[PDB]
Amino acid sequence: GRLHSKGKGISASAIPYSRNPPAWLKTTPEQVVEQICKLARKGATPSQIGVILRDSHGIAQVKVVTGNKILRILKSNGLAPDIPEDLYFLIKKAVAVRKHLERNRKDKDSKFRLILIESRIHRLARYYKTVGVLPPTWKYESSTASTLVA
Amino acid sequence: EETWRVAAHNNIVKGLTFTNDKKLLSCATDGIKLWDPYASPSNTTPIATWQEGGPYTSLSFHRSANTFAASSGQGCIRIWDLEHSTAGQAIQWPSFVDTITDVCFNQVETSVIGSVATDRSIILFDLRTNMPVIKTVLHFACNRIVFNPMEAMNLAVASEDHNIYIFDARNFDKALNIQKGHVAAVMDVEFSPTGEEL
Amino acid sequence: SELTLPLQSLLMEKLDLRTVRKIDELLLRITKGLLENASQEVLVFCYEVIQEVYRSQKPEELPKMDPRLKRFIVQAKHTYKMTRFAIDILRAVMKKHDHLRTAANLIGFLPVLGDAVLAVEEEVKVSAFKMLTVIVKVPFKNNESNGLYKVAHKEAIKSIAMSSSTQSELAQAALKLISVILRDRRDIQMREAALDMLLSKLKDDLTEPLYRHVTFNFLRSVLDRKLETASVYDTLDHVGTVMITNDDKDTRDLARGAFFQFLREYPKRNRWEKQLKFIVANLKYREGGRLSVMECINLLLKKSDEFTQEVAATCFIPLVFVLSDKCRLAAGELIKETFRV
Amino acid sequence: SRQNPSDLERAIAGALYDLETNTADLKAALRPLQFVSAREIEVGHGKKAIVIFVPVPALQGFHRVQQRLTRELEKKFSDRHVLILAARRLTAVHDAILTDLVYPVEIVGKRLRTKEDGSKVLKVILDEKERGGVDYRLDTYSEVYRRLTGRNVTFEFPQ
Amino acid sequence: VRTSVLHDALNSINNAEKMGKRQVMIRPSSKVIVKFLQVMQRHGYIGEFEEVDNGKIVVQLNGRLNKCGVISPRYNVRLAELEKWVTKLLPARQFGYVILTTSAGIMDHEEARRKHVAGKIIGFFY
Amino acid sequence: VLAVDLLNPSPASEARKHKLKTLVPAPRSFFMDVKCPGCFTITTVFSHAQTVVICQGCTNVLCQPTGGKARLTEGCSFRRK
Amino acid sequence: SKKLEVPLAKRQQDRLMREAAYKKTNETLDRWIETVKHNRRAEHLVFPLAQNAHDRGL
RNA sequence: GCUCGUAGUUGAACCUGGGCCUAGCCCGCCGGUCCGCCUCACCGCGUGCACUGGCUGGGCUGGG
């Protein structure tokens, strides 16, 4: 239940029924795919892609219009991030916290949150390793996290 | 002590009635059966049985003739006349799926049949021209319909709204009366044979 | 007989309903194997099988009527399958062979086929019904069948009235028996309440495409003998609109045949003039309807002399008012027939 | 494609050809389509309903325009229920057959209601925002779905 | 978390039969739950249920049953063991049923003795 | 209470239930069409937009994001589908 | 009015036929309205009824 | 004292092509009777809302 901190929180995004039409929200799937490809080329994460689509174009879900999800489409056209988005954001967050610790050390709450983030990264990292995404042996410390940054 | 007992069916006995001669009928999920409980030898075996017509739920016998209607679970009621009908005539609302829970012949006005169904609805039936007549959807499910034995047009539905609704069969716009006193759902309602109590 | 000996030796004992239905399937397929094949012996063999069934049945246990309605119901001992089997053998044999269709052979079966119709089992009832449809036409030299066909007529009407849908096989077999009785035997009169009930039940089965030909066979059978009643008039007022407003030719032609037999047969001038206003209005009337009403006008001009003069006089002028392209060529053929008569 | 024509396949293909010229001023999926497939098997008694099978990207190509195309296909052709569907060759396929059956209206829920014995009845509900023009087409929907698949379903608006 | 969604469903059924309600909302559905309720409906302890979709199950119950339960390790059982397992799980041999995941499907112990097949004990009701 | 039809809740009790707690869950958000009176351009905006949606050019606005529904701007029209 | 009309949809034809059945059943309950009215407006009701006696006119 | 965490432990649901037989009807083909056609004749053709039988011809639906 929201992992680390206590608190349930039922903040969830709903998905409607009939995974096919939203008809009056026109535009062919091919056009949507090409827009997604353009966004990927400009350098945006799948989640950011989805948000952009939500903002401007007549879309509901890519999985509805097109046969595939965004990440799956990116993988088919070989335009996917090095470290699968969420993992990349977590490592960026960990780097930021380490840099804050380096600037000022006594902040024990920041050190605790750093530890939490590292644990969450390890939790993600193990399961990514299992699903043959990331190459075996993946360190997530200041020796490699700093090199990764972006 | 009892007068006559028999291990009738496998499942629970959902509906049961007496014929106008002396014999009694019983529903189940097995199918309905007919026995002669008043005979000079006691017979445990039935003398007629009926399985075709879906899972039956309730029975109701006619006032005068040997006709009876069984409410099934296929959304139809079906009407037999004893001694010259075998499968009966299946009357239904034209596109109806939900089960008809109860069925009740009007004893005053013959050939008017009321029924409730788990669409939270009551439906009527005219037996003279074999078709349904009118269907009203209420808010909650109704467990049982019954008619008034002195006033031919008034009916009462016992419903899961903890409530009894006394309706007029000619104008289903509003309830003639709403009896509200319960705590859990109402399972059975029955008018007095003087027609003035419940 | 080597086939039916172990069956009897098995089903003489106490039995349950699944194996009862098994023996029913076995016996109906024995009858199908019999009806493809030395024929008088087949007749006396059927009679002997039915005699052994009547010997084996207990006379204290008979079908009794319904306690609530005073007639008999059309619906684990399963003895009736042998009767179904034997009458199905008789059905196939008397269907295929004309020289056995004698008045002398079936006097042994006239009290035998009596309890075949009166039985409460659906299988033996439809077997008896199809049997009597085959054996309408035998004179019998003394009108001995003139009580059996009264009984069969009453029970066929009762079975259609008690069946839940007329689209079932028992109601259709009874409808076949009623239609062949009305086509052939003029000794059996029809009751107006029964005919009203039948036509009111067959209003939509007229346009149902699966049973269209059977119900229209029955309707032509009613229109064969003169039956002037309000139900027949009110249903032919509906066959009038079935002729024009229906979509397909296979229903349109059967409606044309029925309405045409009506106009050829039925004996006021006001009414016949109303038919002519109707037919001219449909001529004005969609293009498939124009084609069908033009071919009905053509049939009337062909088969019909004062009526010829009147139908030509009132059909010629709106036709040249009409004079889509197929309807125009058809109207040209129609006015050519008008000039020819 | 797949066909050499029957008696009515050439008639419906001639209707698709005739909707190009001598009419509107609207054609987007009309010229890139050929003779495809059609079927004529009864619905109810007396009436029939025409179904036409469609290649699988042309289903969204037809979701582009289906208002007044099916109106003129009903009026100008035979006065019977016209109905387009994709062609296919399990449970995802039958789900696809349902959601391409109901073309303006999105289905919401499927209620597979059992009875007091082993018998069960499926009933798929529709959207409440479009009710008036579909209810006389519901039995045609149910009968075409039975005739194509074999599973008896009944269509009902929620109340 | 109880991965035994069958146990969550059966806990909801026991709570409704204790509280005297007339229906439930079994929120995570399955197929083994549907087969379980199919056996309970054959033996009449549950009126009528429907699987609606987002799915969940709405289970009209008659008010006839006492207790539902799952056997959590799901032990294997032969027929000569099945008699002793029935008389050790049920309060009486004529009251209630033991559910079996056999090679012929999911059924009660009387249907298992009819169809001459053994299997794993999955649950029971009475 | 004690018995109720759980496969057929009322639309009014269904409509006041939270999103994820309706019988089959579904959203309660909608899409709008928006024009700004000098332009014949029809941008289609989501109801709970997080983007400061801009029309096809003309550095304007169409809505601002919030904690809930996007506040459409000023004088603008909206049909909702 | 001897001209036939177009056949309607099955739902609308059923609805008109069942409206006719509702009018017929309302007539056969309007034959009971007057006795129901007298029973509810009367001052003293005597049960069982005189018409249900098994020796009615003896 | 609380949180993270490894060996360990429990680990969501979703997942039975071809041919043969059979009954009912239709559409069509074929043999004969009747009638008509044409051929000098021999002969053949049309011919089942005139009659009758066949088709391991075609189509739909049900059952194995």
Ligand SMILES: [Zn+2]
């Ligand atoms: Zn603009």
